[PDB]
Amino acid sequence: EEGPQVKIREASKDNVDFILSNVDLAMANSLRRVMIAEIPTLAIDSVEVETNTTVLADEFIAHRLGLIPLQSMDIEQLEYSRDCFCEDHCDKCSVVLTLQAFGESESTTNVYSKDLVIVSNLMGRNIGHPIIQDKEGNGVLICKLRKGQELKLTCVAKKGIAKEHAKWGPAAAIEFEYDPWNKLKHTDYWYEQDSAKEWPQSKNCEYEDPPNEGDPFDYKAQADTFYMNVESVGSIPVDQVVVRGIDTLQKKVASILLALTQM
């Protein structure tokens, strides 16, 4: 469809190995950054503690709670508490969850994210459900209880972005490469005896043609063909991380044309 062109290699619920082509390096990057820092997500951002006789400190536990990825599929149908017209938090802008655990058995009792319970009204939007990907539906190991110890908390999920705190980040890592065959000569290989023999040839050298011995340096070639791979953390479907990445970037520029306008 004339313009930037995707060409997927691998795909699963977690990764999306692909090849962007026919685009400016600047755009590949801005998109690369946006995915890492500005895609909205839901995450625990307030913990009220009724009882903690655990071996850990409240803020210690609270910190982990926020790191627990939550369902953020329909995150757009949720508003930022700062915009919402209520007083603090409400179903229109927040998801409330609870954690009650007691060391009943004499064996060490584990507390997982599965043990979290939504208490607010999700009004039909897939949101706030603690993500689970392990082979036993346990989720993240929040704490451990000895017999007799207790943990009664009250969380409050809210919409956020990585720029504010890395807990709200939907991305895990983002592979990024170009010109696997150092033809644009963007880098100068450090070596002891042989540049070529000492530096491992990358995956993507296969998807390209090695330059020819006698060709004079191509001084007009630019940087197109970027080999990326996005890893989602679960709060959102991989395909989405990318898509919404392009979306937010799009809305950003839009917020600017609208600035010149009402300017």
Partner 1 sequence: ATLKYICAECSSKLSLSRTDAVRCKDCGHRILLKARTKRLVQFEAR
Partner 2 sequence: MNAPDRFELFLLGEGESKLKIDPDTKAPNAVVITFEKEDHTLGNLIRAELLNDRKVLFAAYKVEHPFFARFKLRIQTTEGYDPKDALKNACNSIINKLGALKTNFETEWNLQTL
Partner 3 sequence: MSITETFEKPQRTNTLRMKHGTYDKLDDDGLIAPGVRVSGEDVIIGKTTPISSKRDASTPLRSTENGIVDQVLVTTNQDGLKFVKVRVR
Report the binding-site residues. 84, 86, 90, 93
Given partner 3, Zn ion, partner 2, none, residue 58, with its beta carbon under 5 to 8 Å by kind, binds partner 3
Beta bridge partners of 159: 42
**How many C-beta atoms surround the C-beta of residue 67 within 10 A?**
14
Q: By CB under 8 A, is residue 186 in contact with partner 2?
A: no
Number of residues located near partner 3, criterion CB under 8 A: 3
Span 39-98, contacts to partner 2 by CB under 8 A:
82
CB within 8 Å of 2: residues ≥ 6 apart:
none
Of 89, 50, 47, 51, residue with least CA distance to 67: 47
Cβ proximity to partner 3, 51 vs 201, nearer residue = 51
CB of 207 to Zn ion, least distance (A): 26
Q: Compute φ and ψ for 55, nearest 5 degrees.
A: -90, -5
CB within 8 Å of 147: residues ≥ 6 apart:
103, 104, 105, 106, 109
Cβ proximity to partner 2, 85 vs 190, nearer residue = 85
CB within 8 Å of 261: residues ≥ 6 apart:
none
Cβ proximity to partner 1, 24 vs 88, nearer residue = 88
Q: By CB under 8 A, is residue 243 in contact with partner 2?
A: yes
Cα distance between residue 78 and residue 55, in whole Å: 35
Cβ proximity to partner 1, 125 vs 152, nearer residue = 152
Residue 222 near residue 16 (C-beta atoms within 8 A) = no
Chain residues in the site for Zn ion (CB under 5 A): 84, 86, 90, 92-93
- Whole-Å CA distances, 117 to 3, 129, 141, 173, 235: 46, 9, 15, 29, 17
Given partner 3, partner 2, Zn ion, none, residue 86, with its beta carbon under 5 to 8 Å by kind, binds Zn ion
Candidates 18, 32, 42, 45; binder of partner 1 (CB under 8 A) is 45
Q: By CB under 8 A, is residue 222 in contact with partner 2?
A: no
The window from 39-47, 100-108, 112-120, 250-258 that contacts partner 1 (CB under 8 A) reads 39-47
Q: Provide the binding-site residues for partner 1, judged by CB under 8 A.
A: 43-51, 58-59, 62-63, 65-66, 155, 165, 167
Give me the residues that bind partner 3 (CB under 8 A), please.
Answer: 57-59
